[PDB]
Design a protein around this ligand. Structure first.
Ligand SMILES: [Zn+2]
Lengths: 171, 408, 50, 50, 82, 46
């Protein structure tokens, strides 16, 4: 779920970068670090809007590295359990459907799919369709998937979705 | 008790697991069915048992293998049939292959005995409740109530569950206690078809919970009791410490890889080419890491191990990693932000870019202020050498051009 | 005193006795005997000129 | 470092940026003697040291 | 604590001098940019001493009062007794 | 290989082999001494 927060991060600056552009280097390293980080608490990190401030750098005893605490408003995307969200199919096969919501990769199983949709291996592009064939879900389509499960994976959360609920499908 | 696992103290069958058949306290003897230990070379050469015992001092014991009558028939040994059992060298063998024999209770071990899973496999109620797990009250007056496992015990767990809007704690035994979990939550399987696995449940059937393993997109149905709730990620600790995470292995002489993922049965070793190939524990053999190795790069600069480099070209683009293993034309990079391949990838070294014979001899100093002195070389560098003087109780550094070895 | 022990680079672990660190001198003399239990038993006297 | 641990006004180690320690007693290859800014040297005590 | 009124001694305590010199010398050793002419000098400690004399040390001392508040002083702002 | 040792009592030379129990073949005396080395030894007369 796309969101905007003000977070805090501490960065260690090697004294090599103690030049006139110290603050520029600080912000650059903050971008390089926080950008793209996925954490359990704050979900994924999409981008960094701005830097709230640069707390006074402390000089660690016995190590010239200077610790800078920096506050910064950055966009995140933390999904949940049980929320319909737009998704983009990226590959269809018999085991289940694959869809994408920004950075998060979601998928759909043969239980989450209603009983109407069936596997059609003879279909050259694998697809989920019922006897009426009213709705056919192929690759790249937009589907409404109620998230069900979530799991941290090497500091990178991945979610599992579902569409068993009414109307959850292509539109 | 009949059908119990025991062990032996001494003899040629010591340290062998066995199953009880019958016990005779009056005779002080018990019958144990175990895997036979028979030497085929002995049968081939037709040696006597008494001779084998006479020369037992320098003779190695035979291994454990299932009995085969055809093997002895081929080897020329005599095999006799007595109903279900077969008589060979005064011993009764079962049709399956297990060896039944009688031994004294004193020799047999009946305390501190517990078989291993592999042993049980060759020979071929319980509860799993731990703190911090959600359980339901399937039976009893208070039904359809979910509580946390605050305590744990044996036959009668006597848990103190905390139900919804229920500060007080109840008392339920193991049988009344049941393991149930809500939708869209982490679940781990301690015991099952694929034990030590984690997944998410799309539903919870009355007796067949369904989960999807993170390792692969396949359904996994397990008993709800065998299921457990654990927010902690699957550790995947290797058993027997045969291989460590990020450890070089030599699957083939031409190809060398690093183990990036650890699993109960299979391995996912990353080879130089960068692809992922599955192998087993036994097949893969550990290879030593080149603590000091040389290579080449595009910049034509010296590159060593554990050096931050950038993949400006090649299979990966704009990728940063730390070298962990080195090859003539390949290098293994490491990271912690990379989901793929457990954070370990491989890229070419060239594509990577920057981001004694005199020792122990007796020598005479033939020039300089120490001319005439004699000593023993303890450590000589390519140009200078350390000479311990026999006379002055002191070791000095003398240019090797001022030394002449003294010949006998 | 080059000494070795039979293990349960193979089948032998070094148990030699080295000269004390930072010391130096010349081996004055060596004596070899059997201890109370017949085992070979060697004493080495080393002299250093101070 | 070129002097090494033998020549008294020398050094005993080269701790690279990685944190590894390069021993200068058991003569290593000259490549290992290379120095750069991040590195450091356990130079022998010299006059003026506190 | 508002810096408009700083009741701590205007002088730089010997401990402050020692720690500041050590820290700046460590930085100079790890190649932080220098702030004064380096003419004919390489010792990080001597360079830090030169910087201290020049009042060009780019450090600020945060002294903590017993109350838990603190005062922040530019290094140059403190009298250099020794 | 030879390993000549001097017996303490009779001051007699005698070979001894490794694993050989230490005992002078001549007098049964159990104390022996290694003979002075042959290595070149020098002493500045300081
Ligand atoms: Zn004698």
């Amino acid at each position: 779920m796309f969101y905007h927060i003000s977070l805090e991060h501490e960065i260690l600056l090697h004294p090599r970068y103690f030049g006139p552009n110290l603050l520029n280097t600080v912000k650059q390293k903050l971008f390089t670090e926080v950008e793209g980080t996925c954490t359990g608490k704050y979900g994924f990190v999409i981008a960094v809007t701005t830097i709230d401030n640069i707390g006074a750098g402390v000089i660690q005893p016995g190590r010239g590295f200077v610790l800078y605490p920096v506050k910064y408003k950055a966009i995140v995307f933390r999904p949940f359990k049980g929320e319909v969200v737009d998704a983009v199919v990226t590959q269809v096969n018999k085991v289940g459907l694959f869809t994408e919501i920004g950075p998060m990769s979601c998928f759909i199983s043969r239980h989450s799919i209603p009983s109407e949709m069936e596997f059609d291996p003879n279909s050259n592009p694998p697809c989920y369709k019922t006897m009426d064939e009213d709705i056919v879900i192929q690759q790249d389509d937009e589907i409404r998937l109620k998230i069900v499960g979530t799991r941290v994976d090497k500091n990178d959360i991945f979610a599992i979705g579902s569409l068993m609920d009414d109307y959850l499908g292509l539109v | 008790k009949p059908k119990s696992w025991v062990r032996l103290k001494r003899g040629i069958y010591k340290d062998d697991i066995a199953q009880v058949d019958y016990v005779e306290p009056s005779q002080n003897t018990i019958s144990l069915k175990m895997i036979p230990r028979i030497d085929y070379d002995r049968i081939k050469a037709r040696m006597s048992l008494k001779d084998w015992f006479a020369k037992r001092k320098k003779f190695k014991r035979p291994p454990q293998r299932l009995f085969d009558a055809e093997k002895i028939r081929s080897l020329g040994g005599d095999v006799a049939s007595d109903g279900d059992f077969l008589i060979f060298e005064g011993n009764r063998y079962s049709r399956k292959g297990f060896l039944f024999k009688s031994f004294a209770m004193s020799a047999v071990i009946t305390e501190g005995v517990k078989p291993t899973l592999s042993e049980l496999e060759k020979f071929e109620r319980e509860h799993n409740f731990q703190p911090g797990d959600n359980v339901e009250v399937c039976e009893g007056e208070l039904i359809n109530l979910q509580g946390k496992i605050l305590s744990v015990d044996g036959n009668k767990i006597t848990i103190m569950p905390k139900h919804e809007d229920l500060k007080d704690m109840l008392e339920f035994p193991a049988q009344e206690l049941r393991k149930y979990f809500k939708m869209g939550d982490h679940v781990k399987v301690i015991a099952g078809r694929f034990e030590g696995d984690t997944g998410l449940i799309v539903r919870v059937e009355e007796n067949f919970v369904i989960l999807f393993s993170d390792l692969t997109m396949h359904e996994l149905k397990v008993l709800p009791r065998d299921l457990q709730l654990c927010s902690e990620t699957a550790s995947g600790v290797d058993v027997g410490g045969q291989h460590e995470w990020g450890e070089l292995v030599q699957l083939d002489p031409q190809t060398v890889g690093v183990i990036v993922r650890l699993e109960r049965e299979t391995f996912q070793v990353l080879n130089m080419y960068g692809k992922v190939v599955t192998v087993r524990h036994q097949a893969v053999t550990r290879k030593k890491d080149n603590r000091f190795a040389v290579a080449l790069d595009s910049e034509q600069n010296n590159i060593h191990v554990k050096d931050i480099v950038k993949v400006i070209d090649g299979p990966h683009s704009g990728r940063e990693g730390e070298i962990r293993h080195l090859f003539r034309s390949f290098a293994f990079l490491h990271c912690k932000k990379l989901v793929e391949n457990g954070g370990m990838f491989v890229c070419k070294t060239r594509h990577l870019v920057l981001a004694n014979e005199l020792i122990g001899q007796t020598v005479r100093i033939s020039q300089g202020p120490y001319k005439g002195y004699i000593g023993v070389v303890k450590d000589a560098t390519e140009s200078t050498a350390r000479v311990e003087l026999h006379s002055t109780c002191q070791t000095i550094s003398v240019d090797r051009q001022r030394l002449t070895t003294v010949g006998s | 005193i080059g000494k070795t022990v039979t293990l349960p680079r193979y089948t032998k672990r070094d148990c030699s006795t080295f000269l004390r660190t930072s010391e130096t001198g010349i081996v004055d003399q060596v004596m070899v005997t059997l201890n109370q239990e017949g085992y070979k038993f060697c004493k080495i006297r080393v002299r250093s000129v101070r | 470092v070129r002097r090494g641990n033998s020549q008294y006004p020398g050094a005993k180690y080269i701790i690279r940026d990685n944190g590894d320690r390069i021993d200068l007693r058991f003569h290593p290859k000259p490549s290992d003697l290379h120095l750069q800014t991040g590195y450091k040297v356990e130079r022998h005590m010299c006059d003026g040291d506190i | 604590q508002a810096n408009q009124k700083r009741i701590t001694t205007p002088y730089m305590t010997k401990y402050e001098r020692a720690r500041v010199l050590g820290t700046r010398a460590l930085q100079i050793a790890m190649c932080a940019p220098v702030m004064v002419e380096l003419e004919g000098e390489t010792d990080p400690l001597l360079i830090a001493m030169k910087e201290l004399k020049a009042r060009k040390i780019p450090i600020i001392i945060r002294r903590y009062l017993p109350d838990g508040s603190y005062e922040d002083w530019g290094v140059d702002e403190l009298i250099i007794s020794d | 290989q030879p390993m000549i040792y001097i017996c303490g009592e009779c001051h007699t030379e005698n070979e001894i082999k490794s694993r050989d129990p230490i005992r002078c073949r001549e007098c049964g005396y159990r104390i022996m001494y290694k003979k002075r080395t042959k290595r070149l030894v020098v002493f500045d007369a300081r």
